[PDB]
Design a protein around this ligand. Structure first.
Ligand SMILES: O=C(O)[C@H](c1ccccc1)n1cccc1
Lengths: 212, 209
């Protein structure tokens, strides 16, 4: 009730970044969004069904199947203050780490919704490595999908942050992590976005979704 | 004076939303509309290569092949003041005229923030009328990408925001003689949203080097 964790799986790290080679040896790594990990604040899941309305297979159906301790909402304030010109010397990447007390094979589903419609669905199977009494699932510098690279470039073309925020009111991502054998939902994370108001600095706020 | 080469000219072009209100009453909202003596203003085609499809088969290559008199830029102020909340038909219509009986190939490419997102290709056929030859597209369905795009623009709170988005949105239409492969007309389209009370408007330019 302190972090993005169920009984069987927890997020340690998540990041999306732009890495720009300045020299043969020297690199700038700009973090668009970044989580690295007292009680979490709570949000009743009915407050967010309007942004994730979906019928069959949707958030509501997933939540009702449970377990109710697997469901989180993350709000990101994305830092878009970075140069995106010189494409050749740029790598858009994602990294993440999860941890479990047991050796599971997991299925990770990511759905991106834009103005109501599902625009991307990515499904991957991940496998653990034993490390320090636990089982670790680690993605290191995987390429950011092209949709998201192009979305960032579109946001940055807008002349005012308030326009970026208007667009982002209609943008969500839903991540569902499932045990491949048991089909148990291990983690389900709903993500919403604004652009960070600050000149430089990504922020996040994590909530535990409830229904009480 | 108008969108015309030696071998083909546009008479009419429209995109519309038709909403049947009862058995005999319908609303027809025009998003954009051209119906057609001073000279057209000119635009250097190098200014617009970055907004259109480049590389093999791209605007630059097409322009250099010529003929140079076949190339036009149309700016639309699209009228988005209409209800888009079931009984609706989103449609496109157009008419062309030629002095010769050709089979024509119409290619339409939609480009969004650099990338080609839709390509449509159609073959159209002539009808003789009074020593010339007429081509007509009547109530062809607007592609799903464009409907949706309209619906997304209409969710935005401000027309200036809609116009910022539209700066990186273009459509390229290339009309070719199917048998000779001659370029008959090439029209680059760019967009703004029309202001309140305004309706649909357009401005036509002749692309040059
Ligand atoms: O979704 C799109 O492709 C674009 C858009 C998306 C993100 C930023 C700027 C424009 N759009 C169009 C209408 C609302 C957003």
């Amino acid at each position: 009730m302190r972090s993005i964790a169920s009984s069987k799986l927890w997020m340690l790290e998540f990041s999306a970044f732009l890495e720009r080679q300045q020299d043969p040896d020297t690199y700038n790594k700009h973090l668009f969004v970044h989580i690295s990990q007292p009680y979490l604040e709570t949000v009743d899941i009915r407050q967010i069904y309007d942004k994730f309305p979906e019928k069959k297979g949707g958030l509501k159906e997933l939540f009702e199947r449970g377990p109710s301790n697997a469901f989180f909402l993350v709000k990101f304030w994305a830092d878009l203050n970075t140069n995106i010109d010189d494409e050749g010397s740029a790598f858009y990447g994602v990294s993440s780490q999860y941890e479990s007390p047991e050796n599971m094979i997991i299925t990770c589903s990511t759905k991106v919704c834009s103005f109501g419609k599902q625009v991307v669905e990515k499904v991957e199977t991940e496998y653990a490595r034993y490390e320090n009494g636990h089982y670790l699932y680690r993605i290191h510098r995987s390429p950011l999908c092209e949709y998201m690279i192009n979305f960032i470039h579109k946001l940055k073309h807008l002349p005012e942050k308030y326009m970026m925020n208007s667009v982002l009111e209609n943008f969500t991502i839903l991540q569902v992590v499932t045990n491949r054998d048991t089909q148990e939902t291990l983690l389900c994370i709903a993500y919403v976005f604004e652009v960070s108001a600050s000149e430089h600095g990504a922020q996040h706020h994590i909530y535990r979704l409830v229904k009480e």
